[PDB]
Amino acid sequence: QRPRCFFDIAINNQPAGRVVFELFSDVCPKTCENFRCLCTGEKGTGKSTQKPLHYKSCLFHRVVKDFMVQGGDFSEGNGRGGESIYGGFFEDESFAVKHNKEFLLSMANRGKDTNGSQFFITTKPTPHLDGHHVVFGQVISGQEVVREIENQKTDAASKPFAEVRILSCGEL
Ligand SMILES: [Mg+2]
Ligand SMILES: [Mg+2]
């Protein structure tokens, strides 16, 4: 069975609901294990960042309407940071799953083989990302929460003016 993970979201400290993901561990096992462990916090402290390998209290720092919502920068909160559970970054595992629909879970990166902790959730088909970002899961519930994140007003760097925070997270 494929694992299922969750985020409980708050927007300016007001609960917005839970997003649940299914992870395609049969396609991208190393990528899925990283995300799963970042949900539970179970791998402890990031090697280079020296901060918890954990999405708890992390933000959705980049929102682009009709494109995606992105988070997981636990160490800098702005896209510059993060790290994987393996230390630093890990390689792009599979391009098998297409970015052909809303509500797919995919790895953010800064070029080839730079997977860390940052992830995004598509909000429309984004096929041009195929071969660039590894899709590794999908929303199963909480689509309306994702839409509420997507519709946030953002600053000049596409960061929501509201704090879109992962209040709690884990594995089901
Ligand atoms: Mg390779
Ligand atoms: Mg790129």
Cα(129) to centroid of ligand 2, in Å? 8
How far is it, in rounded angstroms, from Cα 117 to Cα 121? Answer: 13
How far is it, in rounded angstroms, from Cα 96 to Cα 39? Answer: 24
CA 66 to chain centre: 17
Q: Report which bound ligand comes closest to the CA of 109.
A: 2
- Helix (H), strand (E) at residue 30: helix 29-40
Which among 59, 35, 21 is positioned nearest to 140, based on CA atoms? 21
Number of domains in the chain: 1
132 tagged catalytic: no
67 tagged catalytic: yes
Q: Report which bound ligand comes closest to the CA of 107.
A: 2
How far is it, in rounded angstroms, from Cα 60 to Cα 116? Answer: 15
Q: Which residues pair with 170 in a beta bridge?
A: 6
How far is it, in rounded angstroms, from Cα 140 to Cα 32? Answer: 15
Residue 2's contacts (CB-CB under 8 Å, 6 or more residues apart) are 22, 23, 24, 25, 26
For residue 41, what is the domain's CATH number? Answer: 2.40.100.10
Q: Which residues form the domain of 106?
A: 1-172
Contact criterion met (CB below 8 Å) for 106 and 120: yes
The resolution of the experimental structure, rounded to one decimal in Å, is: 0.8
Contact criterion met (CB below 8 Å) for 80 and 114: no
